[PDB]
Design a protein around this ligand. Structure first.
Ligand code: OGA
Ligand code: NI
Length: 235
């Protein structure tokens, strides 16, 4: 998608903690951190076949469908192997996603391949209550526009994701059902008049990069290739 024609998220190579707290965290402004996670072992070490070997056997919850309404999506328990088989390799017809699952409690060994970003300590909370999630799905997975109740560090390990960001002081034009009723990349201009002209920031997130997504900031995600991401929810 055309990102050179959109306002893009600012990228910074290893900004100091102070400059992050003051210019981003406190005011709640997105930023892309560069050269912080890119040498994490996960970056080299996590091929499709690496994961398939070590995790292939474990049972994991799988999203079929997109999350616009509760009734509009469903989950299924299968193995990583069944999942990789049915929704990734060869020619998968339907989409399925391994979203928002805590793989690193299920498999503490993988914890050595990632770190907790230093920037987290600027928050009030304790490292132990930080919620790490895995997001592992094929190209074409869509997580609809919504906001989380915490600060977020989303780390991209494998593949690229297109991400769009609307601030919270912009909720009006987004039409909450929280989560939006708008389809960011195919919007009903008339059902939703106020949306076309709401200001956003966007980005293509690549391997090695971290997107800071400020608490309650609205975000929408579409994967551009086979993808693996790790999120840190923190306060
Ligand atoms: O990675 C995705 O598809 C969606 N991730 C998020 O909504 C999250 O990390 O906050
Ligand atoms: Ni989210």
């Amino acid at each position: 998608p055309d990102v050179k024609l959109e306002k893009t998220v600012p990228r910074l190579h290893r900004p100091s903690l102070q400059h992050f707290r003051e210019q981003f965290l406190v005011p709640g402004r997105p930023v892309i951190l560069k050269g912080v996670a890119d040498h994490w072992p996960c970056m080299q070490k996590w091929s499709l076949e690496y994961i398939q070997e070590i995790a292939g056997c474990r049972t994991v919850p799988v999203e079929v469908g997109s999350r616009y309404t509760d009734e509009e999506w469903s989950q299924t328990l299968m193995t990583v192997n069944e999942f990789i088989s049915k929704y990734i390799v060869n020619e998968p017809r339907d989409v399925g996603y391994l979203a928002q699952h805590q793989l690193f409690d299920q498999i503490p060994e993988l914890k050595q391949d990632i770190s907790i970003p230093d920037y987290c300590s600027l928050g009030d909370g304790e490292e132990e209550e930080i919620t790490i999630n895995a997001w592992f799905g094929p190209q074409g997975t869509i997580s609809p526009l919504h906001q989380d109740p915490q600060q977020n560090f989303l780390v991209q390990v494998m593949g690229r994701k297109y991400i769009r960001l609307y601030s919270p002081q912009e909720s009006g034009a987004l039409y909450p059902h929280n989560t939006s009723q708008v389809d960011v990349e195919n919007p009903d201009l008339e059902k939703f008049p106020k949306f076309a002209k709401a200001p956003f920031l966007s980005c293509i997130l690549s391997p090695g990069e971290i997107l800071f997504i400020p608490v309650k900031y609205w975000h929408y995600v579409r994967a551009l290739d086979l993808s693996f991401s790790v999120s840190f929810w923190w306060s």
